């Protein structure tokens, strides 16, 4: 589900700069976050927490997914897919 | 808190622990009111 | 013990006033200086 | 230009004198993107007839200059600029932005100055106990 | 310490959890043992 | 032929008795000058003097209050809205503000205006107090004014950041006020004496991150304050010292040294074992270098770094036991290391220990050393009150290039009784007058030289307070990387073409001495395009009292100028009835220079304008009036008249000839006239004449000088306009030589293609 989907976020219009110091993922549709009116979603972004978590590899969602077992740190992952995707399902994933 | 989900959400982060104790402070008095809620005073939130 | 200026120098409450320039990235901000206490302390029992 | 108009010509009348240029750096000039390097001609030699045998890559062209006396005009005569091709450096007289010189030279050789002559360094009487560690 | 010892000097500042010195290893160390912030340490050490 | 060159010289001979031929000594008008650019800075000097005297004493006749209740400082904030409509001890003013052509801002001139800085509030005990006993200070200010009412700054920048500036005006004008009267040039240069600085970084391991970016940043504002008396070199050492640039032993702290060190310095890595006694060894000595220019005095080492556990007592014995060297060591970063040594360090070496834990400290941490470096001048007592001038810089209040006379006070509180000295050794802070450039320029009238013939200035350092090629621009520093604080310090060398007699005069110049030099030169166009073979006359004197030194540059043809007569009501109206507006149909179309006849008369950018109301002001009273020039306008007058006679008599039968599309005059006085009507758009010269390149260019050649037009260029290129050709005219009275104006046509390129 999730894989790849943390590299794009609110890029300024006009150069290849991040809009804000902290930046978020966005979407091109409406139920994504969507970028105001000076910016757009531009597609390679690190990543939240500088790229170490998400899910780009088995490796990676190993890591990912132990994190949330620990129940540290796994609410910002349900706020971020919901950024990306959209609240209806995410809940769906971390609450089982 | 607003709708009977969120308010489950918000209730099972807390039990989970993530940062209940800010989500604490962020309730308490004096907090802005939305701007449809019918108040058009800085009066929302409990010591409750 | 748990009062803190938002300006880092000053560290009475008396030199805690006026603004003072916060510097973040490539961007100059003034801010007020405001003597504050910490969200959870010690001054009294209920407190602790 | 000429020099923008044909880079050779231009050049081989600098070199057989026909033309001199001298150089200097305008350190009050904006830029787009500053020091900016300027260059202005003049004739040198002042004397009328000019002529000779420019030479391109395996080809010969043959000029002949002379200049107006009552004016500051010369008249320049050249064989043809299609015939024999010349290598097109273009020589531009406009102002090109530049780094000034080079400081480490300068200072190396610096121009003369006069220092002020008074100076209040030292004194018996002053209080060095204001050291600052003690009153912090 | 050993793996992540004079490590910890980001250009934003040194965290308040680094391995220098052993008081602030010891206190690094336990501090992931109770499981708080023990992602954060994590990212620190990754970063370094 | 098509443009008269006989016949303006024929007309300037057979209309004599109307004008006479008086000289230009140069031996005396560069005295006259020098004179008055003296008596002008007396004038400057006496106000700071009579300041300096009235705050001390105000200040050592005042009470330490410690409460202010309520309203009880009476001041006016120069940052504070004009309509809030709404502390502690202090009431504002609420002043009004009408105008003033001679600043160009909003201004009243009741009270005095005081500007804070952003970082020290406004309600300190140590503001308040300076907030009352400065408060005095008014009165002098007044007083200062009304003696001597072209007086454009007064300001006494204080020792604890607020500055008060007489002719109350808001400050100026995103846009967060970082201003510091304690850093602006005026104010380093009176509270302490030129200093050799050599500033020696730490770039061992230990400082790397954080520490790293700090000292870089504490460094580069460090530099910021030297001026170009100062000497400064940066070394850097984590086991052994180098330096951290190409240079070696010292160097003036110019704008582009500086950018030299700053550049090296923001490109350093930091990595190794810190060792004290091989850094300061090579501060050490390369503070004994003698080989190399310098200051020669007030020779400091400031010491960057974070913390250790070496004192080095045995290199400050071998080094440093006279103690002949002062110490400054800053711990830079926020960290935990032994702070003992350093300390050790300035209170053994007649020092300062600074800390600088954030970016936020590192002005205040920067600017404060001169507080020591004042010490020694401030128990000179009244030794070391000297005016002293600073460079060209622009002016914070948008006033353009101003130079600042500068004189320190000094707290002199338990003196009359001998009381206090332990904290009396700190001034209290520097008086300065501002006096712009455009007066100076006024004290040298320059409308009886020829266009070629100017006024410049030279100080000790070459740099130069007068020169045509000065412009109200920073200068620049180097090539503009992709992606107003500093002086116009323009040497002499560099706002000319450089040459081996000029380096032989510039240091004479500099010396203090006055001669001739009349010597074949190589002068540069106006357009910048063109180098012409000139010979020219450079007469200079010292301006004494000062240590500038003035030069005035004259070919040989501008010995002799040309002074109208008085003449008579009658030739006035007949003359000036020439450029009427309406009028430039049967005598072509008329420019005027906008030079200031009159105090009334203002000058506008658009000549019709100006042209309207100085012909409905020589139609008002009469030509010759008080308030105004009489030999400007005599001049003027006689211009037109002569150009009118020219144009009618010669020009006005031909009407239109085959090879030419407008023949045009341009002379001395100021007045332009291109004979078709129609041409006159096409006219895209300065309306003023001493500014025309052609003109400039025409006058060093006893023979035609064509002029090439602009090449892709927005206006009317070679086909519409055409190729302008000039002729100087030369007129030959009693001996005499002169050369008056410069007549010309444009040649239309289409006959002459067709004649080629
Ligand atoms: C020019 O020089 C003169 C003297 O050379 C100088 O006048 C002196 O100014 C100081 C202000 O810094 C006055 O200080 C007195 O000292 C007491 C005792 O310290 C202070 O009371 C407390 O002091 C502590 C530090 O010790 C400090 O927190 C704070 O200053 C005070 N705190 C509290 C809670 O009160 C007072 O500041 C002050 N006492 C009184 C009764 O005013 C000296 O009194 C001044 N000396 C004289 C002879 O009047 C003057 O400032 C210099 N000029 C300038 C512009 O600074
Ligand atoms: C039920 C009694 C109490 C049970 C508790 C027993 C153990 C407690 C465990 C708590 C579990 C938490 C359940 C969270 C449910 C969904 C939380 C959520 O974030 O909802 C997101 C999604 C968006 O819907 P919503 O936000 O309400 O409004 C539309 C746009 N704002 O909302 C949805 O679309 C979800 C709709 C269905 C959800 C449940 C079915
Ligand atoms: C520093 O602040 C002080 C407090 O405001 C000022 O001192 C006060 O100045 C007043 C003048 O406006 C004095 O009022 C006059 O004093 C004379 C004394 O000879 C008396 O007649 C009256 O009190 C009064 N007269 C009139 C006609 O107003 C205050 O006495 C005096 N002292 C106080 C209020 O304690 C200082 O002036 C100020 N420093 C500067 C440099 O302005
Ligand atoms: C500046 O222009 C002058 C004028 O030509 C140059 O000086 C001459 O240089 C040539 C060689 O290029 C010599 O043969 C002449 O003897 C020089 N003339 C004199 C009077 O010395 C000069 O080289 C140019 N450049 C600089 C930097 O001065
Ligand atoms: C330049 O400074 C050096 C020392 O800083 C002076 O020392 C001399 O250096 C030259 C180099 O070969 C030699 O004569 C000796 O090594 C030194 N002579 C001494 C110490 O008497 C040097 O004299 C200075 N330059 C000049 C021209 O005096
Ligand atoms: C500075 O002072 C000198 C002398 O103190 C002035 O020069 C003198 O000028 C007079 C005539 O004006 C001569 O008779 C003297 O011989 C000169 N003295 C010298 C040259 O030592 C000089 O004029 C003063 N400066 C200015 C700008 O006037
Ligand atoms: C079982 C619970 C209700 C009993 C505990 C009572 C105490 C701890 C709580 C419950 C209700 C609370 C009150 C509810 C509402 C307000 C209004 C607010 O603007 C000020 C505080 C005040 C007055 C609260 C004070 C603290 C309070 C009295
Ligand atoms: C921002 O985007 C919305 C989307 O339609 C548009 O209506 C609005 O005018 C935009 N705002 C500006 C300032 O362009
Ligand atoms: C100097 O001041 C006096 C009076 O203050 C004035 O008359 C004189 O013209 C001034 N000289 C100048 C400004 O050169
Ligand atoms: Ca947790
Ligand atoms: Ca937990
Ligand atoms: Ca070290």
Redesign the interface.
């Known amino acids: 589900f999730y894989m790849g989907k943390f590299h794009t976020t609110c890029f300024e219009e006009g150069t290849d700069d991040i809009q804000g110091e902290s930046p978020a993922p966005c979407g091109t549709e409406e139920p994504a976050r969507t970028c105001p009116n000076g910016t757009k979603c531009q597609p390679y972004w690190e990543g939240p927490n500088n790229g170490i978590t998400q899910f780009d590899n088995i490796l990676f969602a190993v890591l990912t997914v132990f994190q949330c077992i620990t129940m540290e740190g796994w609410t910002d992952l349900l706020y971020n897919s919901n950024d990306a995707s959209g609240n209806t399902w995410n809940w769906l994933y971390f609450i089982p | 808190f607003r709708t009977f989900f969120q308010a489950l959400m918000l209730l099972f982060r807390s039990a989970t622990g993530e940062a209940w104790h800010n989500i604490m402070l962020s309730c308490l008095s004096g907090k802005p009111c939305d701007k449809n809620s019918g108040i058009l005073t800085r009066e929302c939130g409990n010591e409750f | 013990k748990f009062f803190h200026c938002t300006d880092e120098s000053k560290e009475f409450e008396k030199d805690c006033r006026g603004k003072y320039l916060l510097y973040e990235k490539n961007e100059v901000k003034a801010r007020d200086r405001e003597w504050k206490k910490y969200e959870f302390h010690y001054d009294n029992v209920l407190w602790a | 230009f000429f020099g923008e108009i044909d880079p050779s010509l231009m050049r081989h009348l600098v070199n057989i004198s026909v033309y001199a240029f ?1 150089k ?8 787009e ?4 390097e ?1 260059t ?3 004739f040198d030699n002042d004397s009328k007839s000019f002529s000779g045998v420019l030479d391109c890559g395996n080809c010969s062209r043959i000029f002949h200059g002379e200049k107006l ?5 010369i008249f320049i005569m050249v064989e043809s600029k299609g015939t024999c091709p010349c290598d097109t450096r273009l020589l531009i ?1 406009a ?1 090109q ?4 010189p080079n ?2 030279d300068m ?1 190396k050789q ?7 002559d ?6 018996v ?9 003690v009153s912090g | 310490m050993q793996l992540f010892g004079g490590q910890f000097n980001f250009d934003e500042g040194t965290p308040p959890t680094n391995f220098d010195t052993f008081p602030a290893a010891i206190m690094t160390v336990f501090q992931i043992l109770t499981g708080e912030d023990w992602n954060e340490v994590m990212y620190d050490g990754i970063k370094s | 032929t098509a443009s008269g060159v006989n016949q303006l010289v024929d007309i300037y001979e057979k209309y004599q008795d109307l004008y006479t031929v008086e000289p230009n000594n140069a031996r005396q008008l560069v005295e006259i000058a020098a004179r008055d650019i003296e008596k002008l800075l007396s004038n400057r000097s006496k106000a700071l003097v009579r300041l300096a005297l009235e705050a001390e004493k105000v200040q050592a006749a005042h009470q330490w209050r410690e409460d202010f209740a309520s309203n009880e400082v009476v001041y006016y904030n120069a940052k504070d809205d004009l309509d809030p409509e709404k502390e502690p001890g202090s009431q504002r003013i609420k002043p009004v503000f009408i105008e003033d052509a001679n600043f160009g801002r909003q201004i009243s001139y009741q009270h005095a205006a005081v500007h804070i800085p952003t970082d020290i509030y406004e309600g300190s005990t140590i503001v308040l107090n300076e907030l009352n006993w400065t408060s005095a200070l008014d009165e002098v200010f007044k007083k200062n004014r009304e003696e001597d009412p072209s007086l454009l700054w007064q300001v006494f920048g204080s020792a604890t950041g607020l500055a008060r500036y007489y002719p109350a005006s808001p400050w100026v004008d995103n846009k967060i006020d970082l201003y510091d009267v304690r850093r602006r040039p005026w104010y380093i240069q009176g509270a302490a004496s030129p200093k050799d600085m050599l500033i020696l970084v730490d770039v061992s391991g230990s400082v790397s991150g954080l520490t790293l970016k700090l000292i870089r940043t504490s460094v580069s504002e460090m530099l910021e304050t030297l001026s170009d008396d100062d000497f400064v070199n940066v070394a850097s050492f984590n086991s052994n010292a180098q330096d951290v640039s190409c240079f070696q032993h010292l160097v003036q702290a110019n704008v582009r040294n500086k950018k030299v060190l700053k550049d090296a310095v923001n490109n350093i890595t930091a990595k190794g074992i810190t060792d004290y006694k091989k850094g300061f060894s090579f501060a050490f000595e390369q503070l004994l270098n003698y080989n190399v220019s310098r200051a020669n005095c007030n020779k400091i080492i400031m010491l960057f770094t974070d913390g250790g556990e070496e004192r080095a007592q045995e290199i400050f014995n071998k080094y440093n036991k006279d103690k002949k060297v002062r110490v400054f060591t800053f711990s830079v970063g926020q960290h935990n290391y032994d702070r003992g040594p350093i300390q050790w360090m300035a209170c053994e070496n007649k020092g300062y220990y600074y800390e600088i834990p954030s970016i936020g400290a590192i002005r205040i941490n920067t600017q404060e050393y001169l507080d020591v470096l004042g010490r020694p001048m401030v128990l000179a007592g009244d030794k070391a009150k000297q005016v002293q001038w600073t460079n060209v810089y622009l002016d914070a209040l948008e006033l353009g290039l101003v130079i600042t006379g500068t004189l320190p006070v000094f707290n002199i509180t338990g003196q009359f009784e001998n009381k206090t000295n332990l904290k009396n050794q700190l001034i209290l802070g520097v008086m300065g007058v501002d006096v712009s450039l455009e007066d100076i320029k006024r004290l040298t009238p320059r409308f009886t030289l020829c266009p070629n013939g100017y006024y410049f200035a030279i100080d000790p350092n070459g740099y130069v307070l007068l020169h045509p090629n000065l412009q109200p621009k920073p200068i620049g520093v180097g090539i503009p990387t992709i992606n107003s604080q500093e002086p116009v310090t323009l040497d002499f060398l560099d706002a000319e073409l450089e040459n081996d007699i000029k380096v032989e005069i510039r240091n004479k110049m500099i010396d203090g001495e006055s001669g001739e030099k009349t010597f074949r030169t190589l002068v540069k166009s106006q357009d910048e395009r063109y180098i012409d073979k000139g010979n020219r006359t450079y007469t200079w004197t010292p301006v004494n009292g000062t240590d500038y030194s003035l030069a005035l540059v004259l070919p040989t043809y501008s010995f002799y100028y040309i002074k109208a007569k008085l003449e008579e009501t009658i030739t006035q109206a007949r003359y000036s009835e020439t450029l009427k507006p309406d009028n430039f149909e049967e005598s072509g179309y008329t420019f005027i220079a906008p030079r200031d006849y009159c105090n009334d008369l203002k000058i506008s950018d658009n000549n019709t304008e100006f042209l309207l109301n100085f012909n409905e002001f020589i139609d008002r009273k009469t030509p010759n009036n008080p308030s105004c020039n009489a030999d400007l306008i005599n001049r003027v007058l006689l211009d037109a008249g002569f150009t009118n006679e020219l144009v009618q008599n010669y020009w006005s039968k031909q009407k239109n000839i085959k090879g030419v599309k407008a023949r045009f005059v341009v002379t001395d006085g100021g007045i332009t006239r291109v004979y078709p009507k129609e041409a006159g758009e096409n006219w895209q010269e300065n309306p003023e004449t001493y500014e025309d390149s052609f003109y400039k260019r025409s006058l060093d050649n006893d023979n035609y000088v064509f002029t090439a037009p602009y090449f892709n260029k927005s206006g009317p290129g070679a086909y519409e306009s055409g190729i302008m050709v000039s002729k100087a005219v030369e007129i030959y009275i009693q001996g005499k030589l002169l050369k008056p104006a410069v007549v010309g046509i444009k040649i239309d390129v289409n006959s002459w293609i067709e004649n080629f």
């Open positions: 001298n200097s750096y305008d350190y009050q000039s904006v830029c993107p500053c020091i900016t300027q202005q001609y003049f006396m009552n004016t500051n005009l007289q102002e932005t530049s780094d000034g400081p480490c200072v610096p121009r003369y100055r006069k220092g002020p008074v100076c209040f360094d030292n004194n009487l002053e209080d060095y106990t204001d050291c600052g560690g």
